Design a protein that fits this description.
heterodimer, A: about 120 residues, mainly beta, 4-stranded antiparallel β-sheet, 10 strands, B: mainly alpha, Serum Albumin, Chain A, Domain 1, copper ion binding (chain B), lipid-binding (chain B)
Chain lengths: ~120, ~575
């Protein structure tokens, strides 16, 4: 079975940074493009970032361009999101998904950015 | 405890005894009938000691141990080896083309008398002769052929005109035996050369076409059980194959509501009739208005997540979904589409944006669907113009030019079999033509691959046979004329026939002319269809004229020299 476990969320001030981790198990991690998606309260889900299986190709939503960096460690089967200059608008549950799936298949991790 | 006792109990003395005879005949094909009958009797008396007392010595042994030990009392390299290597050695030595006496049937009076005088010996000789000629014959269906071979003699030996009753039935059984044998030979080549995944994929496609109202989970269960049946039969595990086949027929008939509406009459019949009936049953009606596959397989952004959970189950579901909707497609076509889909997910699921690169995969299917459709259309039109015999000649020339290193008898046999597609498929409506034509062609090209395997002289036959089971037909179709082949020398004897040619059947005279045509092409591979048609028309004309003459031997001699002369005139020495 595929298992995805997110951590690194927290309650943080605007302008602070957070690094999220996604521990992936039950598949050849390196063969699969991976994604971060977020669910803010009272908003549609929002695709954030995708990374090719190699780590060579990278995509971002305009809402996070220049602030967030996606990366992966194939050896540790782990996906990362480096989130800098965080904003109130960034408040959401962050979840990693395989290959651009929009549906949450994991506990996720809460990020609250408080004015 | 005792496996031999278990099987003996499960199948009963008669089918146990028939199945051991078949096993021994398939392993030692050159061994005399009398010698096999003795080995079977010995093993059978033993099995009964094991039935009566399970702890009796050597009843705890594996079937392979017991059966190989008995075989080894009469056998060569393989008897020096030990289980499991011994069984593998026996399997490896099965001969697809044994050098055996071509089997002739006596007068109907002789045969009917033999049947009355020695019924059991007469039916055991049938099993023995079929099994040693066809070492991959599906053992449980061979039990059924024997049952029908008995009913033929029982009826027809009472009849007013025996020969009129009996001969058309022995001809139907003989013809259906060769079809059953060729089909089983392809199942075994799939398991042994391409592995259980290859066969499972074949089974998912075929059962999904037949049982389209069945749930995926039902179809998977049947695929599991059917794969186990053919793995055992193709590995020489014949007692457990027949046992497990009887159990699958039982399961299917007890779950008709989960599987098909067409099983009712099959599931009334006795065990051997029922198994055969189920295996050949018509495709059920499709559930009405099934949706497009695009939504869950190409437009969904969940394709790679779903792939990731279970690659083979997700690809299984795709094949099941595609196959149940297309009774009008060949099984090899459906396997080519699924294999395309799979290679698309392997590339695409590693992309930052998998949806972007797999979104047009159904575009890739269009040419894959059209190519077989255009091949059948094109070859059925030629068939309608030429008729069977001349259609065979067209395919002979085509294949001799593709793979001229192949043996003449192999080219003639395979090309004749290729040409029978016309009569067996081209009469069907275009909704039945593709599975009829293309799955039949897969069976015949497997015959080419196995006749060529022992001494693989044609690199291009080896490539087409080994690269991809499911691409075999397209691979052969795409082969160009071989420009590299060095022409062989022409023996004059090729066109020099004798008087007794007039006494042969129409079929034998055609084979003689087809043999000569191959020998021509191998000598003059640049020869035009028009030039080969002239030569072949003169050949026909010379045999008709010479078979009418008073001095036939003279006529053939002279006309041979004329034909060679005319030949060399048109195409050269």
């Amino acid at each position: 079975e595929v298992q995805l476990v997110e951590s690194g969320g927290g309650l943080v001030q605007p302008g602070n940074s957070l690094r999220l981790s996604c521990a992936a198990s039950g598949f050849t991690f390196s063969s699969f493009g991976m994604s971060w998606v977020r669910q803010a309260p009272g908003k549609g889900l929002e695709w954030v970032s995708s990374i090719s299986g190699s780590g060579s190709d990278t995509l971002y939503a305009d809402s996070v361009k220049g602030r967030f960096t996606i990366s992966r460690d194939n050896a540790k089967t782990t996906l990362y999101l480096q989130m800098n200059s965080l904003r109130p608008e960034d408040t959401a549950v962050y979840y990693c998904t395989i290959g651009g799936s929009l549906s949450r298949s994991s506990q996720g991790t809460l990020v609250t950015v408080s004015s | 405890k005792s496996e031999v006792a278990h099987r003996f109990k499960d199948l009963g003395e008669e089918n146990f005894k028939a199945l051991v005879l078949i096993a021994f005949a398939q392993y030692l094909q050159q061994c005399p009938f009398e010698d096999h009958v003795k080995l079977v009797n010995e093993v059978t008396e033993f099995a009964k000691t094991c039935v009566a007392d399970e702890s009796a010595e050597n009843c705890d042994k594996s079937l392979h141990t017991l059966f190989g030990d008995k075989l080894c009392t009469v056998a060569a390299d393989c008897c020096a080896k030990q289980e499991p290597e011994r069984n593998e050695c026996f399997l490896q030595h099965k001969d697809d083309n044994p050098n055996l006496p071509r089997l002739v049937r006596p007068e109907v009076d002789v045969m009917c008398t033999a049947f009355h005088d020695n019924e059991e010996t007469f039916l055991k000789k049938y099993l023995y002769e079929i099994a040693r000629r066809h070492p991959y014959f599906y053992a449980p269906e061979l039990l059924f052929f024997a049952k029908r071979y008995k009913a033929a003699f029982t009826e027809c030996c009472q009849a007013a005109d025996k020969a009129a009753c009996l001969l058309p039935k022995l001809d139907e059984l003989r013809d259906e035996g060769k079809a059953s044998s060729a089909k089983q030979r392809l199942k075994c080549a799939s398991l042994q050369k391409f592995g259980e995944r290859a066969f499972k994929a074949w089974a998912v496609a075929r059962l999904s076409q037949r049982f389209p109202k069945a749930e995926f989970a039902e179809v998977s269960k049947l695929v599991t059980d059917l794969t186990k049946v053919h793995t055992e039969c193709c590995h020489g595990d014949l007692l457990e194959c027949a046992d497990d086949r009887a159990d699958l027929a039982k399961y299917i008939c007890e779950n008709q509501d989960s599987i098909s509406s067409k099983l009712k009459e099959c599931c009334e019949k006795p065990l051997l009739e029922k198994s055969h009936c189920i295996a050949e049953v018509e495709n059920d009606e499709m559930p009405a208005d099934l949706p497009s596959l695009a939504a869950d397989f190409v437009e969904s952004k969940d394709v790679c997540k779903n792939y990731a959970e279970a690659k083979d189950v997700f690809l299984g579901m795709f094949l099941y979904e595609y196959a149940r909707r297309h009774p009008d497609y060949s099984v090899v076509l459906l396997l080519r589409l699924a294999k395309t889909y799979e290679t698309t997910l392997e590339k695409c699921c590693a992309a930052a944006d998998p949806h972007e690169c797999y979104a047009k995969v159904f575009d890739e299917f269009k040419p894959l669907v059209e190519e077989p459709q255009n091949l059948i259309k094109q070859n059925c039109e030629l068939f309608e113009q030429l008729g069977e015999y001349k259609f065979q000649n067209a395919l002979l020339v085509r294949y001799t030019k593709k793979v001229p290193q192949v043996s003449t008898p192999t080219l003639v046999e395979v090309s004749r079999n290729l040409g029978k597609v016309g009569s067996k498929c081209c009469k069907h409506p275009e909704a039945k033509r593709m599975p009829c034509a293309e799955d039949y062609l897969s069976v015949v090209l497997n015959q080419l691959c196995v006749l060529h395997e022992k001494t693989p002289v044609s690199d291009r036959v080896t490539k087409c046979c080994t690269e991809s089971l499911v691409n075999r037909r397209p691979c052969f179709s795409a082969l160009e004329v071989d420009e590299t082949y060095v022409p062989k020398e022409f023996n004059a004897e090729t066109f020099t026939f004798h008087a007794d040619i007039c006494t042969l059947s129409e079929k034998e005279r055609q084979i003689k002319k087809q043999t000569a045509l191959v020998e021509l092409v191998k000598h003059k591979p640049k020869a035009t269809k028009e030039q080969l048609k002239a030569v072949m028309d003169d050949f026909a004309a010379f045999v008709e004229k010479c078979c009418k003459a008073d001095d036939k031997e003279t006529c053939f001699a002279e006309e041979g020299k004329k034909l060679v002369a005319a030949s060399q005139a048109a195409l050269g020495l």
